[PDB]
């Protein structure tokens, strides 16, 4: 039912409005119970997130507590590590750009609060290189914090030691991937590693490592301060907590609001943000989780509620919860076509399926926009789509297939007409 | 992806980190784990790019040298990332975001305007070697869709005219107020701040017990 209270809204400094710097942060009281929390114990911190039942705030959804629990296993003589990926290459994820730029501190204490939960020696934050100015803001914030002694050895007047670092991204969406963030951190080409050796057991510089969406790390302190329950209540069943929602494209006032999760899709454009540009009936389709997730047509939009599972039932993913909206004034065949162009210019090429498959769909999709291709080819694209969905080394091939599948699933008649239109003029 | 040695772009172009640059180089290493320097190739390669936009084959060889890594190792890193430029870069190097979010909100619109203003095709440097236009992909900051990153400036929410204004500012003078040239601060509902219009609770507000 959303409509979270301003007080409950974790990221108050969102939109700025309060000095993003430490003195603004102190009025925010972000560093209020940090010593106590760490003192309580690592086990106490994970109890808090397990009670919260928080889901991954990045595109993949998994219990946050269980993921952190995995490298809580005893150290084998290799320093455990924390990796925070501030890269958000996915379209519509200006979600993270806020916390980093507007409220850098929340993430800094998120890092050490999270750090003792996994017993990480240190945390590296991979902010996308594109955001150079953004980087300027966080290390100013990180510098403030150590000057204070909030972070560093004996951080926050406690036995525990932590050091936080910022790493430059270099314009790659794939760098974002969990195994590939590491390799970029390692300094090799940003190519996802394989799944069997999970990043807990192997990882950055070969030491145990864990990767979290910046929102996931940032919400940690509060979740512990407010307790898992407070946070647990807002969510729906497995779904829980407020997740920032970004609405971009064909809406009167595109904005990122951290309104509550489980929001009726019709409600968030209509009540907050801006009602769909041109009217709620001028909605050809909604992209709920960003480019990777399949778009849902207006038919079900109103009925839909914004939750990780909700969208699942709906065959779409909450993902980064980036709402991209397309009025009846857009050539979807070309809209999704540029997302496949978005993925051919970006996939690493390490795996055969994605390399040739994504390029193959790009070529077919460009012909589809022209209408040159015949109606029978459409099904092939579907078939090409699932070959790439289950065979890829990472999830990006997973992600490339879904928008193609969505276009065929709900807009098959329109593509046939574009097929028909070209055949008629010869 | 092949460096055919050319008089301009080839090692005859000597490269060496400024005494100041070399300094920058070392601290970075320490940022990474001890015994680990290879991990710094990217950050370093970035400072070679900071030094000079061209970053020729000579510059990458130096990077590998300073970082004691297989030279190819640096060559592979430079080729994989779009951030690095292996060819000369225009002083301004504007990049226009053309992913669906920006296109839906008119990103394409901006392009046509910029091509005419720079009076040049998309993808190459102006003769004046003043600006370089490229159709880059999602640069983040989508809520503000019309967008054109210029050396990190990241101007946002721009209407075609605005850019022309910006370009002129760049063409005569400098620092043309980089940022959203709109009336919305950072990202904010153009209407206002529905999320939080109240004052922020202070330190230790409703902090749970335990």
């Amino acid at each position: 039912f959303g409509s979270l209270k301003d007080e409950d809204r974790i990221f108050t400094n969102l939109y700025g409005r309060h000095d993003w710097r430490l003195k603004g942060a102190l009025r925010r009281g972000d560093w209020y119970k940090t010593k106590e929390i760490l003192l309580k114990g690592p086990d106490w911190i994970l109890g808090e997130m397990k009670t919260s039942g928080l889901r991954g705030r990045g595109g993949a959804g998994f219990p946050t507590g269980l993921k952190w629990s995995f490298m809580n296993k005893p150290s084998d003589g290799r320093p455990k590590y924390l990796v925070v990926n501030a890269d958000e290459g996915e379209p519509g994820t200006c979600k993270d750009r806020e916390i980093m730029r507007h409220d850098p501190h929340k993430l800094v204490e998120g890092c050490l609060v999270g750090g003792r939960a996994m017993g990480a020696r240190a945390a590296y934050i991979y902010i996308r290189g594109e955001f150079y100015n953004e980087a300027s803001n966080l290390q100013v914030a990180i510098r403030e914090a150590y000057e204070a002694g909030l972070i560093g050895k004996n951080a926050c007047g406690s036995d525990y030691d932590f050091d936080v670092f910022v790493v430059r991204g270099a314009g790659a969406y794939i760098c974002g991937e969990e195994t590939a963030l590491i390799e970029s951190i390692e300094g090799k080409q940003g190519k996802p590693r394989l799944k069997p050796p999970f990043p807990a057991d192997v990882g950055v510089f070969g030491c145990p490592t864990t990767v979290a969406n910046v929102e996931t790390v940032a919400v940690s302190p509060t979740i512990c301060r407010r307790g898992g329950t407070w946070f647990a209540g807002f969510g729906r069943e497995r779904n829980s907590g407020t997740k920032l929602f970004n609405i971009s494209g064909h809406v009167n006032h595109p904005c990122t609001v951290e309104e509550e999760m489980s929001v009726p899709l019709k409600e968030l454009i209509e009540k907050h943000a801006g009602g769909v540009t041109g009217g709620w009936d001028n909605l050809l389709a909604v992209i709920p989780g960003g480019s990777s997730t399949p778009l849902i047509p207006k038919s079900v939009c109103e009925t839909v509620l914004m939750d990780f599972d909700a969208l699942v039932q709906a065959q779409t993913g909450l993902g980064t919860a980036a709402v991209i909206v397309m009025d009846r004034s857009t050539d979807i065949v070309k809209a999704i076509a540029r997302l496949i162009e978005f993925y051919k210019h970006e996939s690493c090429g390490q795996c055969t399926p994605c390399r040739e498959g994504v390029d193959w769909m790009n070529k077919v999709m460009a012909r589809f926009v022209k209408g040159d291709a015949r109606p029978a080819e459409i099904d092939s694209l579907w078939e090409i789509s699932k070959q790439i969905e289950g065979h890829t080394i990472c999830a990006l091939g997973d992600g490339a297939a879904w928008p193609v599948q969505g276009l065929i699933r709900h807009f098959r008649p329109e593509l046939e007409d574009r097929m028909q239109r070209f055949a008629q003029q010869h | 992806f092949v460096h055919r040695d050319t008089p301009e772009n080839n090692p005859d172009t000597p490269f060496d980190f400024t005494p100041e640059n070399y300094k920058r180089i070392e601290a970075i290493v320490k940022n990474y784990p001890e015994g680990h320097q290879a991990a710094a190739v990217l950050p370093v390669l970035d400072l070679a790019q900071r030094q000079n936009g061209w970053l020729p084959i000579s510059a990458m060889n130096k990077v590998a040298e300073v970082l004691q890594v297989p030279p190819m190792r640096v060559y592979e890193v430079a080729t994989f990332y779009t951030m690095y430029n292996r060819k000369p870069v225009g002083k301004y190097h504007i990049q226009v975001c053309t992913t669906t979010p920006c296109m839906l909100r008119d990103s394409d619109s901006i392009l046509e305007t910029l091509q005419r203003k720079l009076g040049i095709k998309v993808g190459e440097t102006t003769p004046d070697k003043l600006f370089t236009l490229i159709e880059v992909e999602c640069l983040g900051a989508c809520v503000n869709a019309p967008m054109v990153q210029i050396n990190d400036n990241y101007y946002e929410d721009l209407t075609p005219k605005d850019i022309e204004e910006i370009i002129d500012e760049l063409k005569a003078g400098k620092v043309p107020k980089p940022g959203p040239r709109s009336g919305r601060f950072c990202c904010e509902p153009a209407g206002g701040l529905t999320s939080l219009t109240e004052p922020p609770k202070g330190p230790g507000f409703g902090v749970q017990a335990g």
């Binding site: 320093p79 730029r101 020696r121 240190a122 150079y132 100015n133 980087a135 300027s136 803001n137 290390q139 100013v140 990180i142 510098r143 150590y146 000057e147 560093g152 050895k153 030691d161 932590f162 050091d163 670092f165 910022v166 430059r168 | 300094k23 920058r24 601290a27 970075i28 320490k30 940022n31 784990p33 001890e34 015994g35 950050p43 400072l47 900071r50 620092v175 107020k177 980089p178 940022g179």
Partner: peptide
Amino acid sequence: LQHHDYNTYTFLDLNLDLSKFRLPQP
């Protein structure tokens, strides 16, 4: 307007300044 103006070396040089704070290496 700190965001409004920063130099190309802000990130790196700021970091070097932070080096002193940076905890000892592994």
